[PDB]
Design a protein around this nucleic acid. Structure first.
Ligand SMILES: [Cl-]
Ligand SMILES: [Cl-]
Ligand SMILES: [Cl-]
Ligand SMILES: [K+]
Ligand SMILES: [Mg+2]
Ligand SMILES: [Mg+2]
Ligand SMILES: [Mg+2]
Ligand SMILES: [Mg+2]
Ligand SMILES: [Mg+2]
Ligand SMILES: [Mg+2]
Ligand SMILES: [Mg+2]
Ligand SMILES: [Mg+2]
Ligand SMILES: [Mg+2]
Ligand SMILES: [Mg+2]
Ligand SMILES: [Mg+2]
Ligand SMILES: [Mg+2]
Ligand SMILES: [Mg+2]
Ligand SMILES: [Mg+2]
Ligand SMILES: [Mg+2]
Ligand SMILES: [Mg+2]
Ligand SMILES: [Mg+2]
Ligand SMILES: [Mg+2]
Ligand code: NA
Ligand code: NA
Ligand code: NA
Ligand code: NA
Ligand code: NA
Ligand code: NA
Ligand code: NA
Ligand code: NA
Ligand code: NA
Ligand code: NA
Ligand code: NA
Ligand code: NA
Ligand code: NA
Ligand code: NA
Lengths: 119, 194, 237, 46
RNA sequence: GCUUUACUGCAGGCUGUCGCUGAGGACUCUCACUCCGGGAGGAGGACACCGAUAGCCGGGCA
RNA sequence: ACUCGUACGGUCACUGAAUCCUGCCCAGUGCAGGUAUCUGAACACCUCGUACAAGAGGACGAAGGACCUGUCAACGGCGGG
RNA sequence: CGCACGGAGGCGAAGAACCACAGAUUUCCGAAUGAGAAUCUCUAACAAUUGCUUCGCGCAAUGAGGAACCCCGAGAACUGAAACAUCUCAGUAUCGGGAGGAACAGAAAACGCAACGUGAUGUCGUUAGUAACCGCGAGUGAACGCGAUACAGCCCAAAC
């Protein structure tokens, strides 16, 4: 909420999560806020996902601005457990990062473009 | 590269600036409506908690405690007293607020033992601290190489005997040289002059 | 010395408490959602032990049976109404805004919905003078002009039992009986008739206060006695 | 007064303790009840 | 034990200041906070309360 | 606590049924109101000092005081010539 | 066949008595825990607070005691100063909380015989009534070091 500056429509989120699933099976994905943070810093991040129900918010507060000063695109997911499931986890995930997609690069690129437009 | 945790830490260096400032102003509204001791599922300052010994594991508990700000809530003398001992207003307790918070938490969870604690801010009339408590009877802890030490009998009621980090600092045990003549090994053995 | 009587009061011991368990009802205005479709019938008139004044038992449409702070002229069978659209007759309760200026009122609320605070003693009344969209000016029984929210509810008429004060108690025994129904310690021993240890005015070979009676507002309890922050004293000038 | 069942048991015990040292104990020990209590002169508990 | 313009202090009251505390030497606002309301909502409002400190009064008390 | 109370209340004091009455004094003390000007602490602010600090000074000035007023059914006073 | 040396009677070579270890039994109240109660009573009980949790008291914890010792808090006054206020008595008495068989302390953001030096911590001896405090009055009062005792050194957080 304090780190969320725009609302992602349900349909966009659906496309995003689906892309993440084919990303773990084809390319590579990072699960967890610490591993996501390092992707952005190392530049190996193409698309980072951030949950909106994170409590405390401190865990993810830095993702937005950090991503901005790294050119790395980011999208919001309403629920923590959905992001974790999409990343292939049995538990939830506050943040995820698609480290080099795969047979999804087309979709991911669009999602990034759809978000930049959504401001 | 920087850990994600370093960002939580850096935010807390200045709790009155940035996003954290807005977070606190919102949270405290809910906190002021909560009780004296509230068990919380996750620590507000993950980095600090992990740094102090916290682990996302069975038998590890976290609780936020609010304690009033200020000096001793003291009653004025009701018998003869020399001027020196007639004070009320300027007298302050020898145990810091953080330590009071730790004891209040441990009392709430009689079976648990205090591992450590840290500050999570304050408003104009009270301070909040989150205390990390541990279940010395849970096997997930009795088998942990980093935490099993807290299961020993001599660690029972450790907070009440000042064996906590805040307890030890408040007892003047920080320094190993000059200034610790009357604090080490204990305030009591030194005649209570520490 | 010893704590003065005024200090013994605050502790709330039996001697200083009101015989609450013997009281009848906490006289507050009824709560209405809106509309005003709340009327009741006066079923009886009873004596109120907490105020030495009559009170009325009312049975409301929705089955509610409650005692009400009765104005003068209310009798069994009479129909009373409470709400915005209530008729403008004695005994009914409606917000100051719906009340016509120049009409005597009682049991006036301080803050809208508090059930009434002002003008509740025997035979008294407040006078609604000015109206507005912002403030309703009411003159309280003390003579003070009070600015109130027009939403503050009030009862039309003067409080019942007027003139109670007109008759002298005549004897100690009569005062005694009334005093037993209040949160008060009686009789009253003069400070000047006590020992120095018991009061700032106690002591001496004869009876007289040992200092001026006018005490500062800032005086501490145990010392604040006599004429408290008196702007003046006596009758002359 | 109204005695309870427990008070009654205690009074009963005090009465029993108020007996004398049997004759044979004297012979067996080759030669006093230090707890002899009179209802009037003494006072029981409770 | 008691008294007081004895000495020295200590409560308590009044008052400035700092923190809570925010937006645009006089002013507006609302978002903390306070109060009223069952609720919707209303009043008040960065004051007050509370924490800290400073000056004055202070046989109420030692 | 007062208070299931709300000035026709209740708190704090003085005097002490009724009857006839209750004079003069506000200088001191007390309380209270006002106050151009004077005085009046700390924080912040300005000057000096110190690579910082201690410290010295200034500006502003709250309550309070000075000063003015009210008040004796307030403490009390009602003489010598 | 207790103290306890009576009377009657009984037990023991089927090895009693007696002693050691282990086991059985172990009423009611009592932390006292289903609820109430001056040791009794009423109609299935971990009451209460917690952790885990199959979210069910299912598995567990706490409570109270103990000669003093020990640790963490609250903290006088008589007295001394030939009065007394700071000071002193004294962080004493007493009070609140709590551990153990011992506590506590403990592997340097140390020491500072200043060094090309020492090397976790208690404690004992000494350093010394020294330095330091103090109506600079009365009083108060260490430490480093040294000689000893005993010796022991490690685990996380983070980076990856
Ligand atoms: Cl503990
Ligand atoms: Cl009366
Ligand atoms: Cl050395
Ligand atoms: K003394
Ligand atoms: Mg020791
Ligand atoms: Mg009432
Ligand atoms: Mg009268
Ligand atoms: Mg009474
Ligand atoms: Mg009298
Ligand atoms: Mg007398
Ligand atoms: Mg006196
Ligand atoms: Mg007289
Ligand atoms: Mg007189
Ligand atoms: Mg018999
Ligand atoms: Mg309220
Ligand atoms: Mg005295
Ligand atoms: Mg029981
Ligand atoms: Mg002396
Ligand atoms: Mg001397
Ligand atoms: Mg000493
Ligand atoms: Mg040294
Ligand atoms: Mg390891
Ligand atoms: Na505990
Ligand atoms: Na000290
Ligand atoms: Na007198
Ligand atoms: Na008897
Ligand atoms: Na005496
Ligand atoms: Na005068
Ligand atoms: Na005067
Ligand atoms: Na047994
Ligand atoms: Na149990
Ligand atoms: Na259970
Ligand atoms: Na002497
Ligand atoms: Na003396
Ligand atoms: Na001294
Ligand atoms: Na040497």
């Amino acid at each position: 909420p304090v780190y969320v500056d725009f609302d992602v429509p349900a349909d966009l989120e659906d496309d995003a999560l689906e892309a993440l699933e084919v990303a773990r099976d084809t390319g590579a994905v990072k699960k967890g806020t610490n591993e996501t943070t390092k992707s952005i810093e190392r530049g190996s991040a193409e698309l980072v996902f951030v949950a909106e129900d994170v409590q405390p918010e401190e865990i993810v507060m830095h993702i937005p601005e950090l991503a901005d000063e790294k050119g790395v695109p980011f999208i919001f997911v309403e629920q923590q457990d959905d992001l974790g499931h999409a990343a292939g986890l049995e538990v939830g995930s506050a943040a995820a990062a698609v480290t080099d997609a795969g047979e999804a690069d087309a979709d991911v690129e669009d999602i990034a473009d759809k978000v930049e437009e959504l401001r | 590269a920087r850990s994600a945790y370093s960002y939580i830490r850096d935010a807390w260096k200045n709790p009155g600036d940035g996003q954290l400032a807005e977070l606190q102003w919102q949270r405290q509204q809910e906190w002021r409506n909560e009780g004296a001791v509230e068990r919380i599922e996750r620590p507000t300052r993950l980095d600090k908690a992990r740094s102090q010994g916290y682990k996302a594991k069975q038998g590890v508990i976290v609780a936020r405690v609010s304690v009033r700000k200020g000096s001793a809530r003291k009653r004025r003398h009701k018998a003869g007293r020399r001027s020196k001992r007639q004070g009320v207003t300027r007298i302050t307790r020898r145990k810091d607020i953080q330590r009071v918070a730790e004891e209040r938490a441990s009392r709430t969870f009689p079976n648990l033992r205090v591992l450590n604690s840290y500050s999570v801010g304050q408003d104009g009339r009270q301070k909040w601290h989150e205390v990390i408590l541990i279940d010395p009877n849970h096997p997930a802890i009795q088998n942990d190489d980093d935490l099993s030490w807290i299961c020993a009998d001599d660690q029972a009621d450790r907070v009440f005997r000042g064996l906590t980090g805040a307890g030890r600092r408040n007892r003047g045990l920080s320094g190993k040289g000059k200034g610790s003549e009357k604090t080490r090994p204990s305030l009591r053995s030194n005649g209570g002059k520490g | 010395g010893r704590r003065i009587q005024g200090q013994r009061r605050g502790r709330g011991t039996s001697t200083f408490r009101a015989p609450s368990h013997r009281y009848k009802a906490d006289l507050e205005h009824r709560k209405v959602e809106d509309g005003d479709v709340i009327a009741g019938t006066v079923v009886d008139i009873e004596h109120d032990p907490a105020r030495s004044a009559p009170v009325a038992a009312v049975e409301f449409e929705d089955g509610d049976r409650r005692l009400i702070l009765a104005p003068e002229g209310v009798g069994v069978g009479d129909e009373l109404q409470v709400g915005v659209s209530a008729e403008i007759a004695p005994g009914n309760t409606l917000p100051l805004a719906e009340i016509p200026e120049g009409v005597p009122v009682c049991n006036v609320e301080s803050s809208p919905g508090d059930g009434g605070k002002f003008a509740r003693a025997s035979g008294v009344n407040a006078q609604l003078l000015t109206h507005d969209r912002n403030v309703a000016v009411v003159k309280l029984p003390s003579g003070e002009m009070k600015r109130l929210d027009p939403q503050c509810r009030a009862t039309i008429g003067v409080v019942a039992g007027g003139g109670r004060t007109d008759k002298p108690f005549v004897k100690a025994g009569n005062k005694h009986h009334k005093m037993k129904a209040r949160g008060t310690k009686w009789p009253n021993v003069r400070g000047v008739a006590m020992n120095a240890v018991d009061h700032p005015f106690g002591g001496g070979g004869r009876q007289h206060p040992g200092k001026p009676k006018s005490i500062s507002r800032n005086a501490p309890p145990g010392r604040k006695v006599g004429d408290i922050a008196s702007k003046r004293t006596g009758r002359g000038g | 007064g109204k005695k309870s069942k427990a008070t009654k048991k205690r009074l009963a015990k005090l009465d029993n303790q108020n007996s004398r040292v049997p004759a044979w104990v004297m012979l067996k020990t080759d030669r006093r009840n230090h707890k002899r209590r009179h209802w009037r002169r003494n006072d029981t508990d409770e």
